Amino acid sequence: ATQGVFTLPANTRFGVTAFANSSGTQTVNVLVNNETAATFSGQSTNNAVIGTQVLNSGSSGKVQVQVSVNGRPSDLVSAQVILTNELNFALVGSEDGTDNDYNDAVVVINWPLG
Amino acid sequence: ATQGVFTLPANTRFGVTAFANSSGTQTVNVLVNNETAATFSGQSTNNAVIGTQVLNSGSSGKVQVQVSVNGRPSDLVSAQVILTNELNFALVGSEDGTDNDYNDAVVVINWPLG
Amino acid sequence: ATQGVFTLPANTRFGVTAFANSSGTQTVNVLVNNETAATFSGQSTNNAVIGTQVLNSGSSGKVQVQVSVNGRPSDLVSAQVILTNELNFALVGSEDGTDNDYNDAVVVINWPLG
Amino acid sequence: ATQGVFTLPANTRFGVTAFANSSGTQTVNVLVNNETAATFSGQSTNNAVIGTQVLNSGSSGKVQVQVSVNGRPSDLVSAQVILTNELNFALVGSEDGTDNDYNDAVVVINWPLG
Numbered sequence: 001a002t003q004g005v006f007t008l009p010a011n012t013r014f015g016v017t018a019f020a021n022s023s024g025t026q027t028v029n030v031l032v033n034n035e036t037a038a039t040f041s042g043q044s045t046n047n048a049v050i051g052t053q054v055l056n057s058g059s060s061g062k063v064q065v066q067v068s069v070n071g072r073p074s075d076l077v078s079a080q081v082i083l084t085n086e087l088n089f090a091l092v093g094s095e096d097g098t099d100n101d102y103n104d105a106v107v108v109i110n111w112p113l114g
Numbered sequence: 115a116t117q118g119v120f121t122l123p124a125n126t127r128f129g130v131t132a133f134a135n136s137s138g139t140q141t142v143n144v145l146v147n148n149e150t151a152a153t154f155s156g157q158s159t160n161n162a163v164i165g166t167q168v169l170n171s172g173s174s175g176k177v178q179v180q181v182s183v184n185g186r187p188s189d190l191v192s193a194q195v196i197l198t199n200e201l202n203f204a205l206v207g208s209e210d211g212t213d214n215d216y217n218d219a220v221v222v223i224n225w226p227l228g
Numbered sequence: 229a230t231q232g233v234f235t236l237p238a239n240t241r242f243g244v245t246a247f248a249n250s251s252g253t254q255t256v257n258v259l260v261n262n263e264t265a266a267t268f269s270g271q272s273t274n275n276a277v278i279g280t281q282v283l284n285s286g287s288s289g290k291v292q293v294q295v296s297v298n299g300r301p302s303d304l305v306s307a308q309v310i311l312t313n314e315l316n317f318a319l320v321g322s323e324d325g326t327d328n329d330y331n332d333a334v335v336v337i338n339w340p341l342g
Numbered sequence: 343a344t345q346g347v348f349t350l351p352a353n354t355r356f357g358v359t360a361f362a363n364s365s366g367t368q369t370v371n372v373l374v375n376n377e378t379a380a381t382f383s384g385q386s387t388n389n390a391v392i393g394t395q396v397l398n399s400g401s402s403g404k405v406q407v408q409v410s411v412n413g414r415p416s417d418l419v420s421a422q423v424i425l426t427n428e429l430n431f432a433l434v435g436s437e438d439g440t441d442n443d444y445n446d447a448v449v450v451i452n453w454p455l456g
């Protein structure tokens with residue numbers, strides 16, 4: 001199944017934050033309407049924040065997260081959770097190797113803001 | 115129901131990260147086995163990452179998040195999600211006012227790390 | 229925070245199914261647009277399905293679950309989960325007593341159907 | 343990533359319930375410790391409960407859901423969500439064709455019971 005693709009309400013600000021947990025340098029690309037809108041890159045085995053940003057979901061509301069390590073695409077896992085019918089989290093884990101901890105880059109998208 | 119309380123794997127490092135979205139200054143306390151282990155604070159209506167820290171869940175694994183504004187406790191919402199039977203997120207929203215957006219402080223706990 | 233309230237896409241069919249795990253008879257009311265659209269009732273300590281039905285979310289998409297036992301509303305917990313950006317679960321637990329297992333009536337709403 | 347595999351607490355009763363939404367007859371097999379413990383089959387495009395049963399997670403706690411149509415495995419998606427640190431849902435969707443609604447068989451596992 002496709003992973004890392006989310007439909008947000010149109011024209012809505014959202015936060016995107018990435019953490020790293022791997023020996024490999026993580027490159028996280030955030031697409032809005034199929035065009036790159038943010039890119040973060042960093043290396044940590046201690047959950048360091050490698051980027052955070054606020055983006056707008058635009059007319060389509062389509063947001064996609066991609067993760068790669070030295071050009072090799074990571075396998076993704078994802079889901080969306082909504083609390084009290086208001087607060088949204090779109091969550092992504094990724095695997096760059098063999099251990100299947102799926103934390104090598106972790107990406108959190110949250111909305112609404114403000 | 116009780117919210118903002120999570121049983122983590124014992125003795126395990128986790129990330130805890132807080133975001134602010136309110137005119138009120140947020141204070142987030144993170145308790146491990148009923149003792150304050152981290153405190154974050156700030157004021158943003160644009161999702162500022164007011165704190166991020168790596169903690170150990172300790173012998174019992176009990177982690178609790180509390181949020182206050184002006185010394186008054188915010189109302190909390192929470193859940194835990196697990197992806198591919200291994201990647202964990204404990205999620206908290208909080209409300210300091212009347213609009214019920216529940217984003218006034220948002221807290222994300224993630225494990226495993228490394 | 230309010231629990232058991234979900235905004236579905238408008239005019240969309242959804243499944244609603246209730247399970248019982250309590251000494252007490254559970255009555256589950258499913259509201260669409262703030263009117264009771266279905267009622268289930270039964271008693272089980274073995275997770276019996278006490279009702280299942282397909283409903284339409286109607287023009288507003290507002291769906292609410294309420295649970296009563298022994299003449300008093302049960303305390304509710306809830307969340308919505310979306311898998312692969314397609315498959316939606318709106319989940320409700322409820323507590324009629326003191327043990328806080330929150331399974332006394334469990335309600336699962338799923339969409340889309342077909 | 344692997345989907346449809348969950349680790350439950352050992353020796354614990356759980357509910358498993360399957361719904362169908364496809365022109366194809368769904369076969370749902372629920373494995374405990376790698377051996378089939380329940381099986382449900384049926385065709386519906388109206389979310390019929392093609393089966394619901396109480397199982398015990400046994401010594402290993404390992405539960406896996408498999409879905410197929412006339413022997414051909416469906417593609418699975420899954421996640422687990424925990425409410426108020428106690429109430430557990432393990433969720434599975436599946437796709438037997440090309441439209442990616444992932445509702446062709448929907449399986450919900452819930453615990454604790456009683």
Ligand SMILES: C/C(O)=C1/C=C(CO[C@@H]2O[C@@H](C)[C@@H](O)[C@@H](O)[C@@H]2O)ON1
Nearest residue numbers: 021022023024096097098099101228
């Ligand atoms: C092909 C490629 O890039 C790798 C990198 C690793 C080491 O493994 C990576 O770093 C370790 C310190 C762990 O965080 C592990 O989860 C991660 O996958 O294995 N394969």
Ligand SMILES: C/C(O)=C1/C=C(CO[C@@H]2O[C@@H](C)[C@@H](O)[C@@H](O)[C@@H]2O)ON1
Nearest residue numbers: 114135136137138183210211213215
């Ligand atoms: C106690 C205290 O400081 C407040 C501030 C507000 C205004 O409301 C707060 O700020 C607004 C800009 C919104 O983000 C709103 O969701 C938030 O609840 O109400 N109470």
Ligand SMILES: C/C(O)=C1/C=C(CO[C@@H]2O[C@@H](C)[C@@H](O)[C@@H](O)[C@@H]2O)ON1
Nearest residue numbers: 342363364365366411438439441443
């Ligand atoms: C292998 C087999 O039997 C099928 C049936 C379909 C048609 O598609 C199936 O039925 C339709 C009515 C929709 O519910 C669709 O989501 C489902 O995938 O595709 N493959």
Ligand SMILES: C[C@@H]1O[C@@H](O)[C@@H](O)[C@H](O)[C@@H]1O
Nearest residue numbers: 249250251325327329456
């Ligand atoms: C048999 C018992 O019945 C009621 O007391 C429930 O609140 C308990 O959770 C338990 O199911």
Ligand SMILES: [Ca+2]
Nearest residue numbers: 100101102104
């Ligand atoms: Ca890894």
Ligand SMILES: [Ca+2]
Nearest residue numbers: 021022104228
């Ligand atoms: Ca890792």
Ligand SMILES: [Ca+2]
Nearest residue numbers: 211214215216
């Ligand atoms: Ca607010």
Ligand SMILES: [Ca+2]
Nearest residue numbers: 114135136218
């Ligand atoms: Ca706010």
Ligand SMILES: [Ca+2]
Nearest residue numbers: 328329330332
């Ligand atoms: Ca109870």
Ligand SMILES: [Ca+2]
Nearest residue numbers: 249250332456
């Ligand atoms: Ca009970």
Ligand SMILES: [Ca+2]
Nearest residue numbers: 442443444446
């Ligand atoms: Ca399908």
Ligand SMILES: [Ca+2]
Nearest residue numbers: 342363364446
């Ligand atoms: Ca279908």
